[PDB]
Amino acid sequence: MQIFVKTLTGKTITLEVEPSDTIENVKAKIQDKEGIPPDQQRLIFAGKQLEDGRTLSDYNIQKESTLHLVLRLRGX
């Protein structure tokens, strides 16, 4: 299934995903497209911070739904 990842900046990232894919796998799929290390990445769905070990099914994220991408910045 296809999902989207939007920054509050207005940038939309297209991901190919499964409902069984963890937030950790999703964070890995973002790094493979945008080169952002997953420790910098923080995902939000419907105002809730998504935890690494949970899946897409667990938050009920559907085919063609959007997650928000927010960034932890160091040095911041």
Add this chain to the structure above:
Amino acid sequence: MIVFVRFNSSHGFPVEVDSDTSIFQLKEVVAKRQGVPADQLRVIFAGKELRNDWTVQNCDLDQQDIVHIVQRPWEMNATNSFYVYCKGPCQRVQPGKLRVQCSTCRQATLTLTQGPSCWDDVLIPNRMSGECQSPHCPGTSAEFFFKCGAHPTSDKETSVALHLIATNSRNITCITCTDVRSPVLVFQCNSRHVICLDCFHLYCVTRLNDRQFVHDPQLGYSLPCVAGCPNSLIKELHHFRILGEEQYNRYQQYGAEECVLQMGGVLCPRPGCGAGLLPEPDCRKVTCEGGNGLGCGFAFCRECKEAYHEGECVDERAAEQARWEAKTTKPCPRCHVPVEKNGGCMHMKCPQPQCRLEWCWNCGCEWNRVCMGDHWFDV
């Protein structure tokens, strides 16, 4: 006189009206300002919808007050326990079909030990036990999924169950407009207050514009009962898909914005940026570094939000009527012996040794796949 209008934004804009200007005329002003038809506009002021014959003065609308404008165009049959949000072709709330499959093989081979009696049984995963009828498979638990029943559906073409929406069978008046509409949204407040889908749109849209949605880190961004009842926040947040794609995306955007803040970060202050930045616990310098996105790439003070410096900077009566709960037996359809129903599950088994008819409590027919699909349990 200047009154401030919020129309699908938390950014209020000024409008010039007089004390004797009617709400019909206020609507005409807003219609001209947004290039929208006036008949499609609803005026909401401090929870109440203002009607067309009232004047600005009557509604106690003083200089620099906030009004909202929400654009809104004006046995035999099936009984539906479950409603879903069909993302297409319907793009709306439709009655759905409950389905089962094995947790293991993910096939319709799992025969349940007993049927679901409530939403917890079908919403919490691996809460129900059964036996997979396929030979080589150790499937002990069931997996329930929902489908839109309005059209013919594919295997993987599932939809989120909107467990709050119920068909208004007992003809309960809405908490806000006091009318009888169906389906309704039923809140999980102790009074189980019922709101029609039109009033619910008005409640969410105005609350969104006001930034009056609640943030709970363990839930996200939601709203309680209209009446304000404690412990009543909407838990399944796809319920807001009822507002339509445009409002839903705005709700998701405001929610992410509230989430960032609740986590202690910041939003980039530069025009049109607003990047969700999470600076380290002890930081005053924050850099909107993107290079792609969240590319700004501004460096600002976490406090003053200027460029980084070094130094310092409801009706009680209506609510009473709008409650979901405010005769015990049915005969078996074959032997006519009355049976008392225990719990919410619709699958009855006659205890008469000569009979033992398996039938639907709701329909009074023998138990089938349609009754399981349409209403395995009652609400």
